[PDB]
Amino acid sequence: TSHCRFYENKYPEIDDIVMVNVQQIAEMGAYVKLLEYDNIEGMILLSELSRRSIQKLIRVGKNDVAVVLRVDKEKGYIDLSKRRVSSEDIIKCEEKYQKSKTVHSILRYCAEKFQIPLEELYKTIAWPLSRKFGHAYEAFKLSIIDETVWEGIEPPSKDVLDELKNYISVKIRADVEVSCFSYEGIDAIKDALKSAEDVKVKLVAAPLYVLTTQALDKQKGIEQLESAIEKITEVITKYGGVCNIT
Amino acid sequence: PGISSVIPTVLEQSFDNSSLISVKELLLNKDLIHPSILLLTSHLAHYKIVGSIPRCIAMLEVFQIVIKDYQTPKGTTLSRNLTSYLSHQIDLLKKARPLSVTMGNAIRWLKQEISLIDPSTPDKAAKKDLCEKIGQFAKEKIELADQLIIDNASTQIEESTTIVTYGSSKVLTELLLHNAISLKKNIKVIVVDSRPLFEGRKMAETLRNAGVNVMYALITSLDTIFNDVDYVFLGAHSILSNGFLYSRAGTAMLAMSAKRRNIPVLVCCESLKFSQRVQLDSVTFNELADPNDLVNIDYENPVERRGNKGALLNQFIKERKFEKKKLAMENKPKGNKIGGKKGSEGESKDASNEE
Amino acid sequence: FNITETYLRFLEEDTEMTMPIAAIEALVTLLRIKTPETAAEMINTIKSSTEELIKSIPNSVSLRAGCDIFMRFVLRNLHLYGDWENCKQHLIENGQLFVSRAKKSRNKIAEIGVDFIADDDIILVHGYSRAVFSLLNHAANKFIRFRCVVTESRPSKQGNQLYTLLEQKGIPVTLIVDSAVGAVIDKVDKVFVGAEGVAESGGIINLVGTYSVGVLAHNARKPFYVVTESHKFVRMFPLSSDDLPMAGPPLDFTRRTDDLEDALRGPTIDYTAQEYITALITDLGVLTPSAVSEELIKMWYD
């Protein structure tokens, strides 16, 4: 289920910047939904959303840039403004929206795996990460280099935490064509296996060896595969045979 | 350069306002023309499906392909031989089939975009943003606008109603598909067709594929089908500054009968369809085609018979001439649906000044 | 606080407070209580009250039109991104100023639209609008010679009501039935009409027999007039001759009866096309054909 606000409190304030995904058009303005501050409706009027004929502008398509004017903290009524946001601030509005969208993507694997509500998981994360650290994206960037933010609050789900770390972190296929014509070769292939595995190396046929090299940041698999080619060439030159690598 | 002059059939005593000629089978041409243009010209020369709206969409997509294939020369800049190449395209299109109004507004938009971008920015960064803008332009002025016509028509049509149509207009096909499937009403749709091409047949075929109660008729059989009908939808091509409806073949005949038999005429249109050119009769500027399509006893399209007709050149005066794009009279249609919602036909140039 | 109840309070009043101008004044009073500072709290509740008003409507069109213009003016207020307070004060004040504009417009038209009635012309008048009768009265004030023919319109018996209001002025009259209205167009110089609404297309929204008048006049080539105050414009496009917003009957055919109770049912509001109107008169200048649509395009900006 997709709910719960990005911030701590339900309703916005004055001067705070948001990003809206347009839902309707014409007459008043647009009763919609937000991608920066909750999924409830927050209305704007045609005047605000014009500045600068118009029908071609957005009309419930992608995303814009708006600033909250009037908030009702009783039942739920939000007013916005598109014009007011300055050109220098627009780039900052887009980056906060990108930060909010990454936080929402992070807090969705947790609800899928352990079959528990998303609002409870959003509440337990947004206390040391969102309130004390600054933002949840930079706290996640700190946790992947050296775990220091995650160690504060104790997690009831550790298997979800391992699944999320695996998602932040892919096998690249490699085939070796062994065609040895030497006196001793079995001990050589065993020596080449002990240097490359210690990722997953399997046997399919007598000449062909299938090995999948794991990559953390995708480009890491190339450097380790090239090191594996260098280690295979060093092994077979001494015994008296040839190993062809693709 | 191309093939010019030497035309089939007689020059004709009556009706000689437009060109009647052209290249159908490819013989002697320049070896620089992009093949997607060559495909479209061979398509439009013997086309059965298109009618105003889709022709421009195809013309836009071909242009998008050309820009994607375009790599700027090291010596000559972007605005050097592009506009000459585009002028070669239009001239080849003119030879094949006279352009629509929507095609002209597209070319005018593109030529405005060439002048807007100065040769100073990197070439790969230039064309990447250009095609994005064209895509957004095609979204706004066609697809999203079409959807706006759809919903405007939806409120206008009453529950459980009979509609008679004509042509093969993209907007009306989708209109009727929206009526049958998304809204679910009792819509009896009657389709009419002429002789040069089976536009209505194709529309009826597509409606049958949806599963609609369809009657299929002809111009000769009109004074029997009416005596039932509630609304008549016409496939627009161009509405002038006058307010006259320049559309396909059997259009005005229907419009006349409708006005006299009480029930109104409705026309769905685009904001790109309006022009500032003006005329008052069908004779003015007509889209003439070769009598070769009218030689055979119809039934389907290719039958190849040893019939009664055959000779046009050797026969002592036998002008078997037909027109394609005709004019409906001004007072007869009542509603127009566009980007600016609604407006009667007598208010034609409230879009051209609004731009 | 109610808006339908405020409109219901106008029973013995009327005449000065025109039906839409009283509904617009009721819209401003409902706006000024619960703070117009918020645009989410107020506009949504204004929209709900207009929806409640439409649901309570039996056979009125002009109340829906008047709401639109109000809305438009409200939105246009703070279009200059002005102080959220001086713009508000100008919005609340433009309620009494809106009603005061109905008097100023009537002062304009009654001096403009007396020019159409020439030296000694017999008029066949149909319907009753406050603008058309004000032309008729202030021409008698101008001391001009004109004869009058009364049409027997059948809604709540309007012909008899019109006839009595003409008697109070001092202008010679006689009753003509809408059946025989064809037999009058030879001794009549000009035909006048007062409309309930004017279409986007350029046609007219009117009473129980007005299209019939329009066509007969088109046959006899005798001029056909529409005179109104400039607030009766809706974004409405009646596509066919017999299609209109209704709460009651769109032509009902009843079963066999002996006591005789179910009979009356006929189209009480009828449309006429753009071609039949020769001339149209409002305070917004002297204009007829494509003018109405241009007004609507200017207002709606679409």
UniProtKB/Swiss-Prot annotation, chain A:
Changing residue 59 to A: Alters the binding mode to the eIF2B complex. Disulfide bonds: none annotated. Pfam families: EIF_2_alpha, S1. Residues 15-83 form the S1 motif domain. Its main location: cytoplasm. Changing residue 50 to D: Weakly impairs derepression of GCN4 expression in amino acid-starved cells. Keywords: Cytoplasm, Initiation factor, Phosphoprotein, Protein biosynthesis, RNA-binding. Changing residue 50 to A: Inhibits derepression of GCN4 expression in amino acid, purine, and glucose-starved cells. The keyword Transferase does not apply. SUPFAM superfamilies: eIF-2-alpha, C-terminal domain (SSF110993), eIF2alpha middle domain-like (SSF116742), Nucleic acid-binding proteins (SSF50249). One of its GO terms (biological process) is formation of translation preinitiation complex. It comes from the Eukaryota. It is found in: Cytoplasm, Cytosol. Phosphorylated; phosphorylation on Ser-50 by the GCN2 protein kinase occurs in response to low amino acid, carbon, or purine availability. Phosphorylation inhibits the guanine nucleotide exchange factor activity of the eIF2B complex. One of its GO terms (cellular component) is cytosol. One of its GO terms (molecular function) is RNA binding. The modification Phosphoserine is found at residue 50. InterPro entries: NA-bd_OB-fold, S1_domain, S1_IF2_alpha, TIF2_asu_C, TIF2_asu_middle_sf, TIF_2_asu. PANTHER family: EUKARYOTIC TRANSLATION INITIATION FACTOR 2 SUBUNIT 1 (PTHR10602:SF0). Eukaryotic translation initiation factor 2 eIF2 is a heterotrimeric complex composed of an alpha, a beta and a gamma subunit. The factors eIF-1, eIF-2, eIF-3, TIF5/eIF-5 and methionyl-tRNAi form a multifactor complex (MFC) that may bind to the 40S ribosome. Interacts with CDC123; the interaction is direct. Interacts with GCD1. Belongs to the eIF-2-alpha family. This is Eukaryotic translation initiation factor 2 subunit alpha. It comes from Saccharomyces cerevisiae (strain ATCC 204508 / S288c) (Baker's yeast). The lineage of its organism: Eukaryota, Fungi, Dikarya, Ascomycota, Saccharomycotina.
From Swiss-Prot, chain B:
One of its GO terms (molecular function) is translation initiation factor activity. GO terms for cellular component: cytosol; eukaryotic translation initiation factor 2B complex; guanyl-nucleotide exchange factor complex. It is found in: Cytoplasm, Cytosol. Coiled coil: none annotated. Residues 342-352 have a biased composition (Basic and acidic residues). GO terms for biological process: cytoplasmic translational initiation; regulation of translational initiation. Residues 328-355 are annotated as: Disordered. Component of the translation initiation factor 2B (eIF2B) complex which is a heterodecamer of two sets of five different subunits: alpha, beta, gamma, delta and epsilon. Subunits alpha, beta and delta comprise a regulatory subcomplex and subunits epsilon and gamma comprise a catalytic subcomplex. Within the complex, the hexameric regulatory complex resides at the center, with the two heterodimeric catalytic subcomplexes bound on opposite sides. Belongs to the eIF-2B alpha/beta/delta subunits family. Acts as a component of the translation initiation factor 2B (eIF2B) complex, which catalyzes the exchange of GDP for GTP on the eukaryotic initiation factor 2 (eIF2) complex gamma subunit. Its guanine nucleotide exchange factor activity is repressed when bound to eIF2 complex phosphorylated on the alpha subunit, thereby limiting the amount of methionyl-initiator methionine tRNA available to the ribosome and consequently global translation is repressed. Present with 10300 molecules/cell in log phase SD medium. This is Translation initiation factor eIF2B subunit delta. The lineage of its organism: Eukaryota, Fungi, Dikarya, Ascomycota, Saccharomycotina. The gene is GCD2.
Swiss-Prot record, chain C:
GO terms for cellular component: cytosol; eukaryotic translation initiation factor 2B complex; guanyl-nucleotide exchange factor complex. Disruption phenotype: Inhibits GCN4 derepression in glucose, amino acid, or purine-starved cells. Its main location: cytoplasm. The keyword Protein biosynthesis applies. The keyword Cytoplasm applies. Gene3D superfamilies: Translation initiation factor eif-2b, domain 2, Translation initiation factor eIF-2B, N-terminal domain. It is found in: Cytoplasm, Cytosol. One of its GO terms (biological process) is positive regulation of translational initiation. SUPFAM superfamilies: NagB/RpiA/CoA transferase-like. The modification Phosphothreonine is found at residue 288. Keywords: Acetylation, Activator, Cytoplasm, Initiation factor, Phosphoprotein, Protein biosynthesis, Repressor, Translation regulation. GO terms for molecular function: enzyme regulator activity; translation initiation factor activity. Belongs to the eIF-2B alpha/beta/delta subunits family. Acts as a component of the translation initiation factor 2B (eIF2B) complex, which catalyzes the exchange of GDP for GTP on the eukaryotic initiation factor 2 (eIF2) complex gamma subunit. Its guanine nucleotide exchange factor activity is repressed when bound to eIF2 complex phosphorylated on the alpha subunit, thereby limiting the amount of methionyl-initiator methionine tRNA available to the ribosome and consequently global translation is repressed. PANTHER family: TRANSLATION INITIATION FACTOR EIF-2B SUBUNIT ALPHA. Component of the translation initiation factor 2B (eIF2B) complex which is a heterodecamer of two sets of five different subunits: alpha, beta, gamma, delta and epsilon. Subunits alpha, beta and delta comprise a regulatory subcomplex and subunits epsilon and gamma comprise a catalytic subcomplex. Within the complex, the hexameric regulatory complex resides at the center, with the two heterodimeric catalytic subcomplexes bound on opposite sides. Present with 8970 molecules/cell in log phase SD medium. The gene is GCN3.
